């Protein structure tokens, strides 16, 4: 069927992790200058106040013992 002429006419017209690293950088007691390393001193009175703390290896030596195969902790 023949198209209406109007249709044809119309168409044509249209066409914080960053800071956490910074804190890790901040907590350094050791830096190198020249040929001589340098180490930070904490105050002696502070060390007296702090408790004696633990050794990590003694607990880990226990931990590998506590998780041993023979124990069958499972």
């Amino acid at each position: 069927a023949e198209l209406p002429e109007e249709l044809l006419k119309n168409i044509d017209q249209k066409d914080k992790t960053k800071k956490r690293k910074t804190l890790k950088n901040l907590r350094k007691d050791s830096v190198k200058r020249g040929k001589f390393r340098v180490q930070l001193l904490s105050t002696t009175q502070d060390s007296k106040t702090l408790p004696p703390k633990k050794e990590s290896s003694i607990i880990r030596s226990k931990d590998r013992w506590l998780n041993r195969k023979a124990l069958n902790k499972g």
Partner: peptide, 24 residues
Amino acid sequence: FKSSGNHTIFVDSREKMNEFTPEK
């Protein structure tokens, strides 16, 4: 014989550590 060893220098303040200079 010339010495070959680390020589750790000790400072109280972290700030003092930052500007530490071998000359000074």
